[PDB]
Amino acid sequence: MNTVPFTSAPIEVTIGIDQYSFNVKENQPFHGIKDIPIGHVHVIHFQHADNSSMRYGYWFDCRMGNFYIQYDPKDGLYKMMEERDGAKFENIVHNFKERQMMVSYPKIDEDDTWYNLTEFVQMDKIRKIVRKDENQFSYVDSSMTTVQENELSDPAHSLNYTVINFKSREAIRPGHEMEDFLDKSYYLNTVMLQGIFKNSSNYFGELQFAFLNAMFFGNYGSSLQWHAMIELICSSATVPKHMLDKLDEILYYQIKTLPEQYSDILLNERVWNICLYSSFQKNSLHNTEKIMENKYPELL
């Protein structure tokens, strides 16, 4: 069980940790989050009380280093930092714990929700999508645009998701235009799975990382990447049975976790109606179709 201590909380803020959140008052004696489950990636995230614009946060794994949060009054945000001194960090954490100044990661023992949302997400892949090599953790906010959004503008602060474009020379073999546009199996299986991602685990990790960025930061380009990656599988006639079974499971837990009140902005009517009702895989997503029809019948 690992810990992210906070030096202080000088500004009122809603603090997110994975799917949980806590309101912290201005100058409240809050000193961090303890009992964070080892073996998963995590996201700590922030929404200032005064400016409910720019949701922002850090992707981290506690196996990689000792991480803390400290407010910067100049840049006006909660920053993640690494503590290189193991003994200074253990001594900070033990003090705050002894004074019970830390919220406990509030996991219910039955509850596999975070595991189910981050099953294929790995810090090494997040750090290739979010490029800041001097840090072991990754910053994402509401406003960060994708490499694909840029092409249609500061490259340093971009989300480098795999570009998917159904009407690209990448997607369409010369002389197989109608076949490849109507049945994306060659784009999915040769170009993306064999070619770029190497295996379905990397593909699903990016998909799941894109959803979480869309959900936790309202990051619009992330939502676009999540739908594109669902649409590529559903629009392919030829998909390994194991990938379809896993996709159903992935999508079920994303739809299950989505705040009911954000379905209108986070879900693309056209993609979901096409995937569940028109696509080759319309009958291959039993769990997803049942939770969608029971939770968001308006959208369909």
Binding site: S168, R169, I172, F181, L182
Partner: protein, 237 residues
């Protein structure tokens, strides 16, 4: 974006463009079977590819053999149209390739965009104009070369005959759309109007009769009348 009444003069500027109409690509007669079910029999079709500035028509004849053993023919027809237009473009020298292709049916956009990926600088545009290019098979010589074709063929025509000698491309396209709208609304009547005076013939190298400027005004007037009557009938107004 979309070509409408507001940007109508752009058709006659010096940027090479082509209209593509796919209406007459996939043509069938519906009949009863011996067991009293229904079945279609394809007939020869045609892609109607027109430069509105010059009148240069690229009539790609779609022979029935292209449908043999194929499925979902009305979807395939859009893709096969897109393949053939893309092939035409590649076959033209650089300086003759269009800078825009306007499809008369929005269902042609994605097939054509996908077949033209190699040509990112050629804009594929829809139109809000209801153009009567469907009536092209009401032009006897076009109908004749399509129905006689025993294999895939490309035939080159000037749909304006020699009109551009005497009138601008705006006026020639107005005349052509009026003749085609008439042929589309009442074929029998339109054809009667065009040939009712036997002294006025169609030159071997032309599609329409050799009307004088005065005679074109009479004809155009008779075509307007035909279109309004039929409208009053259709709608009882």
């Amino acid at each position: 974006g979309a070509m409408n009444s507001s940007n109508y003069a752009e058709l006659f500027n010096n940027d090479i463009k082509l209209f593509v109409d796919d209406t007459n690509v996939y043509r069938v007669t519906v009949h009863k079977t011996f067991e009293g079910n229904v079945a279609t029999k394809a007939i020869n079709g045609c892609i109607f590819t027109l430069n509105p500035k010059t009148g240069h028509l690229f009539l790609k004849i779609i022979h029935t053999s292209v449908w043999a053993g194929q499925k979902r023919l009305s979807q395939l027809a859009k893709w096969k149209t897109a393949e053939e237009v893309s092939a035409l473009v590649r076959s033209l020298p650089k300086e003759e390739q269009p800078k825009q292709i306007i499809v008369t049916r929005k269902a042609m956009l994605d097939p054509l965009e996908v077949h033209m990926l190699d040509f990112p600088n050629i804009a594929i545009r829809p139109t809000e104009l209801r153009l009567p290019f469907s009536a092209a098979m009401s032009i006897d010589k076009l109908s004749d070369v399509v129905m006689k074709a025993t294999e895939p063929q490309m035939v080159l025509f000037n749909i304006y005959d020699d009109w551009l000698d005497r009138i601008s491309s705006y006026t020639a396209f107005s005349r052509l759309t009026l003749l085609l709208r008439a042929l589309k609304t009442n074929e029998e009547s339109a054809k009667m109007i065009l040939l009712s005076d036997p002294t006025i013939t169609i030159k071997s190298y032309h599609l329409w009769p050799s009307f004088t400027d005065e005679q074109w005004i009479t004809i155009e007037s008779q075509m307007r009348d035909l279109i309004l009557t039929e409208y009053g009938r259709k709608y009882n107004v």
